[PDB]
Amino acid sequence: GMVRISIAGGNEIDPGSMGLTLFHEHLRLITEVVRWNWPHLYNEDEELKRAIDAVNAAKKYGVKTIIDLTVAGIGCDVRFNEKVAKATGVNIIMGTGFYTYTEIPFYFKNRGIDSLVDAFVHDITIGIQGTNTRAAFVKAVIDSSGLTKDVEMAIRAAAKAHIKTDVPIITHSFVGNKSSLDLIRIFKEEGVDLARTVIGHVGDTDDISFIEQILREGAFIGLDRFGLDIYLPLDKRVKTAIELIKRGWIDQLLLSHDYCPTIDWYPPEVVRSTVPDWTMTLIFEKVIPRMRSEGITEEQINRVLIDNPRRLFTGR
Amino acid sequence: GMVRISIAGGNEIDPGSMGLTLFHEHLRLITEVVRWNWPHLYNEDEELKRAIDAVNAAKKYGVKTIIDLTVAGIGCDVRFNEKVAKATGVNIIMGTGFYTYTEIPFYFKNRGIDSLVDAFVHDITIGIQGTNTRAAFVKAVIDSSGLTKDVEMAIRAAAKAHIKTDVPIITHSFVGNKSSLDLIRIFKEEGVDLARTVIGHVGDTDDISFIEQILREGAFIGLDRFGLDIYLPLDKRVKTAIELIKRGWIDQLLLSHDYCPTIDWYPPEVVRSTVPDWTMTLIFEKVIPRMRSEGITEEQINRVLIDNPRRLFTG
Ligand SMILES: CCCCCCCCCCCCCC(=O)O
Ligand SMILES: CCCCCCCCCCCCCC(=O)O
Ligand SMILES: [Co+2]
Ligand SMILES: [Co+2]
Ligand SMILES: [Co+2]
Ligand SMILES: [Co+2]
């Protein structure tokens, strides 16, 4: 009767039971080819401990549900997420897609777009990685390389999988080249209702004119990297969030941290040194209190953190 | 007192016991990110049967040793190769390297070349994938995209790992853009003895003067894709191999098929339709009999299929 959302560990929830949700986080971000070939560079016990400690920190602030935006290309592992879910009791929602900024595998290029659609559709309708945990969203990615041929093919495939299954599309974009607008254009060509999409990493700018260009199209926007000052400082992100509420856009806003308890792209020392304030709790510690002090209401914070993630999954 | 070569399944051999060797083959060629995320697209039992069947086929012609050129990027799996080795009794030599034509992972780019060197050195000195099977060679790869910055880094890392460990370098190149010559240039910059290297896929051309430009540098050349007519037809490959022995180059020639019993880049029906003669035995069925017919001797075939693979590993 309702949408059914698989969560890690074998169960399903309805959108109404998501509760307070962090819509864009990670449990472990790692690179399949490196981990497959060089296991010596990794420590699964420490990775799991870090994920568990971060999710438990969020749970203390009343987070009920975390959407793990880790998909193929950045190391999605259902079985690892099952262990975090068992340990913390937080609902972990997973998805499908192919994360790349430039190229896709020969496997798919040599078979054509439908082979990639079909793999996503498999995950959504049957289950991820031989499990009964189905993908509840599809991801599309674009970054500072722009719309390469292969990047365009993967965005189109995500769009086509959404058309077949009706799961929402959660995206990653790069604000510096206006690549967010390419997602919009392709999604419209493919017939996607933009209200079932999130334009990711829009919080990495404070350019209101650019942000409202996206918002006027009807998509959700991801104010989704709070704590990554290297993309945009915290004070600018909070000022932007507050201004967009004051201009009437609350129903389109989604907040998160994009936190990676492990990320293999960089040594852990370098992450600590560069973005020491990045955690999975900074929204609760710093952002919400500042918004409340500037007149944002309790019920407006609930609309953003509860209603908006729920409606991404249900529609109107 | 001799070089020690690990082989799949825990043991070590010396170069003198390699015997008749196929120096560039594959047992399973698969894409890590795809197999990790989409296991439904694969069938390990079928992959294993195909690898066993091909290796057994070669074993019937007296092959004793196969060098698996599958490294990171094309799905190297020591445990898989252990199964094949146990079933067939053929010695399987493995290596290390990073197979790419364009990019390498952020993991390494963000840490610097020495991180990639160190990973290769780990495989050579400790072992691959948590096993006591050590990499006995290092691979460097360039193709139709030419010398990208990341390709350059991986070629240089291969060279630096060779300088530290003395294992041979076995390469992949692409003949249409003369990328083979970028390998040589970089290896010379890094101080590599080219006699300890193989310039791969040189058999994809019949341009004898180009092939000789590479030969005069002192490296081994890989006449290594017999049966891949899409790269060069069989008759042209065999004519080239005969001519190069007649000209005096035998000590630098290596023959193989590059055969992939499974390859996930293309559906199997497409492979069968396009290269229906590609197998791990075509050299024995078609190539050697034509060479013998044209005056190449029994001993010359042994020098190429036994002595040259051995000398790659001993100097
Ligand atoms: C030199 C900068 C080092 C620290 C940078 C932290 C990295 C932020 C990674 C952004 C999120 C990972 C990828 C993704 O989730 O799309
Ligand atoms: C248009 C269809 C072409 C199908 C032909 C099969 C091609 C296989 C060649 C790849 C060789 C493996 C990669 C490598 O070993 O470097
Ligand atoms: Co992202
Ligand atoms: Co993310
Ligand atoms: Co090759
Ligand atoms: Co090969």
Numbering used by the authors:
A (entry chain B): 0 to 315
B (entry chain A): 0 to 314
According to the publication:
Interestingly, VmoLac was crystallized in two different space groups. The structure that was solved in P64 reveals a homodimer in the asymmetric unit, as previously observed for other PLLs, such as SsoPox. A clear extra density was observed in the active sites of both of the VmoLac structures, although no potential substrates were present in the crystallization conditions. Because of a relatively good resolution of the structures (1.8 and 2.35 Å), this unexpected density could be attributed to a fatty acid with good confidence. Therefore, this density was attributed to the simplest fatty acid that fit the observed density and that was present in the expression host E. coli: myristic acid. Notably, the bound fatty acid adopts a slightly different binding mode in both of the monomers, and movements of residues on the active site loop 7 can be observed (Ile229 and Tyr230). As expected, both of the structures are nearly identical (r.m.s.d for α-carbon atoms (over 315 atoms) of 0.34 Å), but some slight differences can be observed in the active site region (loops 7 and 8).
The phylogenetic tree that was built from this sequence alignment, indicates that VmoLac belongs to the clade of the PLLs-A. Kinetic characterization indicates that VmoLac is a proficient lactonase with promiscuous, poor esterase and phosphotriesterase activities.
